[PDB]
Symmetry: D2
């Protein structure tokens, strides 16, 4: 679905910013809580999940292991 | 680390439900730092000395605030994921 | 709005919403200068919308963008 | 400073049409710095020694990239403003 890495990265980055925009709208409108299926569209829940999706997609393309990264952050957290 | 476990661990450490704007501001701050790390091409998986400013760090920091905001807003990300799995299959 | 923080928070949410819509417009390559009929969803419209909220935030935060420009102009001339 | 004059002055100084992503990354970087300045309450109109990290600086920096992107994408902001002004009075 993408061969040239920078175009894949650029696409997912545009999508991340689009979902952050939709997240801003959902939070502004107070669409909090845990929706059922019928309530999911435009909920804060859906938009947070959508941002997460693109964070994970960007990690994949950038060769980032989020679990290892978390591990390192925890090491520093404990120092501090 | 399971998603629900990360969300729960973040809640134990950092949960200020009366400070919802704090978390939103921080999310946008981290998204900006992420933009910088991508522009500068700081990709790959860093060792501890390379961590600061890396794409890896900034992605993790965005993730942290997504989870912290989920806790603030009464969202179960793992359950929301399950729900999204259903819709995207339609 | 009477209470300034709520005004600021509203405009900041709107700014982020418009930056998202801008990202979509650029991704889709909706460049150029639209006619009235092509305006909706154009890069032009989203840039203007982002600008609107920048100016709205300047107002609420007591920022003079003309004066700020003048100051930046100076510093830039040393770079 | 007219909006059209600001846009054209920025074009004179900084116009790299083959670097469209540069400008978009920078816009998002400035929006994040704006978020920080607002969270920290760095409001008002700063003097020169107060400028760095101020809400004023970050708002100007976002404005700069909005104008720079307009140049990149063939957008006339003043004309766009006029078109939006037309629609706003209608509804
Ligand atoms: Mg969405
Ligand atoms: Mg960071
Ligand atoms: Mg818009
Ligand atoms: Mg700045």
């Amino acid at each position: 679905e993408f061969d040239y890495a920078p175009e894949q990265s650029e696409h997912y980055f545009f999508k991340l910013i689009e979902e952050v925009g939709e997240l801003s709208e959902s939070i502004r409108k107070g669409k909090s809580g845990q929706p059922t299926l019928d309530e999911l569209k435009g909920s804060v829940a859906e938009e947070l999940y959508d941002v997460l999706y693109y964070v994970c997609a960007l990690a994949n393309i950038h060769g980032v292991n989020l679990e290892k990264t978390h591990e390192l952050k925890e090491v520093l957290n404990k120092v501090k």
